[PDB]
Write a protein that binds this DNA or RNA. Sequence first.
DNA 1: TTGTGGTGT
Length: 849
Amino acid sequence: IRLGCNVSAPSGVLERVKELMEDYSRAPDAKFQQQFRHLLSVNFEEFVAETKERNADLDWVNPKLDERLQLELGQRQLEENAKKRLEARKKLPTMKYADDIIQAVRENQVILIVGSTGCGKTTQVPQILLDDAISRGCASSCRIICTQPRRISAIAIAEWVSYERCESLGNSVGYQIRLESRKARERASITYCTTGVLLQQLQSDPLMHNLSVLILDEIHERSVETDLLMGLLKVILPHRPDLKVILMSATVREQDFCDYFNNCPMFRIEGVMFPVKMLYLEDVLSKTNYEFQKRMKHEAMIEPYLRRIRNSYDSRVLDKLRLPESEGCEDIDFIADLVYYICENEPEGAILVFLPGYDKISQLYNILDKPKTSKGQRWRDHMAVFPLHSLMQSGEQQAVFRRPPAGQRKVIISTIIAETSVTIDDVVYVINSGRTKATNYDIETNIQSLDEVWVTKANTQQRRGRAGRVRPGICYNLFSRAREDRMDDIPTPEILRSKLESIILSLKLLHIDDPYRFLQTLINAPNPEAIKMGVELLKRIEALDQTGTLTPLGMHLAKLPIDPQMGKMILMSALFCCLDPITSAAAALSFKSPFYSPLGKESRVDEIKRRMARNMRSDHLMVHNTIIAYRDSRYSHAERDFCYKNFLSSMTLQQLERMKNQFSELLYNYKFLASSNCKDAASNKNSEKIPLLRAIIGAGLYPNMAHLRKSRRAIHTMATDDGRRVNFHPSSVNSGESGFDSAYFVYFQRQKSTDLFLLDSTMVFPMALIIFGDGVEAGVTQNTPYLCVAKTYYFKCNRETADVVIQLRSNLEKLLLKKALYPAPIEENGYEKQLIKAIELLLSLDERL
DNA sequence: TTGTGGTGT
């Protein structure tokens, strides 16, 4: 055992802490206690009955509305706005099947519609089912929900389908996503939403009584939400005979879904696209004759393929495919030559180059921008080059989407972001390096890593169509055809890679009490070791009790749109009056940092972060400071200048602000706050006290802790509580810093790439860890009296302080248990406020003099 | 000294 610094407190302070605890301990309407007890008392049978009663609205129809819409449809079909738009809609493949689709839905509860881009299924299939019900004079009985993986999809598809109907948004077509909606009318309507919205609405309506038609789209992409929803439909659909489901998929393991729902009807709908010629590494080295130079394994794969094709390609081509570095992005200069080649031959069109990461995007960018070769210098001023990465500004500006200046060919160097989330319409030529990066989590060693990997067959299939949007394109694949056959079908479904805390807890509100029983029924069942490890985390933060049942705290957390650890942090912040800074830190960890990282500006950006951090040694507080500065710039009408100087995304910042206000209102709705403004003065009386902030930030991120032993920019010896060596990720404001007031840090995310990195961190103090943590005991190890936390970090503490801190932790526990069962804001002068003021005092001892 | 991508009445 190694002993750390002294946490003992002066007599005057311990005297006051004790006086305050005694005030608190002298204390003597909850609908929520009734709601919580009622959830736990019903079995599943009673749960299904009761929800049927509260969501009855769709048992009611409006014949005057049925008729009036039946009438306005037939009437407006003779006008000239429609009948051209009906006629151009009849050009889409999906419409050929309308009557066969209507019949399949009528005769079956679940059916599957399989089709690729341009078949129109997403825009057309809702309109078909809706205009049918209108025409038969049912319009008021028809309410259609169509889920989408991505926010942008949901809006744009909803604006489009609305235009096709000669209506503004908000009438028969609407969209709802997180914190934004243009809702359609209540009946006879189509609603596009993100898959997550539909899941949250299950809490109020777990059997989907408020919809007549559910349409899941892009289920082949295997997002966590659509996998969950399909599992949950196996539970729901037996109790909902009148409910109609349409599954929708690309042709990517489409049988998996047809299998999963009995053997249900499957429509295949032919695509609309310009053909994109597929070439491989043999075909590229055949055209450009590029020459390489500056395990095997690889020899075992390629040689058998070379034999079958030996008379279809030159012997020097086949000899190049034997080089390990011929495949992928290992040689950037090779890719550079391919871009130059397409500039020389081939018609005008944009090149989209798929490389795995930020590192490789910079390399090709520098080679294309500052060319060393003569051919590159020829082409340099004739290319308009956009790097495209989730961290770079180009995605959020207008340039990369528009066609380039005349005489310039647009070359986009992108990550997998250009596969779906971001689409550029003028791309005619796709260079697919075949390499992407992946996050893997090893459950055994508890290390998440970020590794370069080969893409899957589905990735390549998708990237090919990115060349076929405008005219016939070409897709250049920088791997052999032999590699393709070794590639997996689809990427590992997201749920097999994901932390299960949030899902497990969420199921409890749906009266799915056994996560092992339920999660096993998905298309791909998660490792039960991941389920257990999720249950254990929820038990650790006391969202589930020892027998695994929901606690009152856990029902609250289950009701916040954030992971349960950060939901708990936000609650603490209400009780401890730091609401504005803590919700900023919470919102940024859930979504993302506002900082761009443009090419070449890295150190300029490390400077801006360090500046905004205001020497507080916290990535999380640093973001809040940024949001404070952002707000002040709008009050100053300086906003746009402010975002340019500091390399900040205004789209991200406004989104953080929306998330924060959402957490404000929910907590105010739950009676933890007196005001739904996250800037409200009562809620923020502590928001200036930085040790209190670090304590609450730590309360959320515990138990992720690190200890720093070294010196030198500076060099760091640091290890997590598990013993493993780590460093601050170079993008964290703590990288290379020295002169920390404390040797302890908490972090949200640890990731292995070229080292074991803490992606984000806050400097914390031992007294805060002890109060809000667990594994606390007092003792004597050598001849020193100690106080520990997590049975890991042992601190010198005299006995008077240990006996107070431990009495303090008991009262804090008793308090939280009360506040969760009987929600009500902490009264400013009451008994509860005394215990808060006791903790404020003890934590304030670590203030910087 | 370095960062695949989604998302939550």
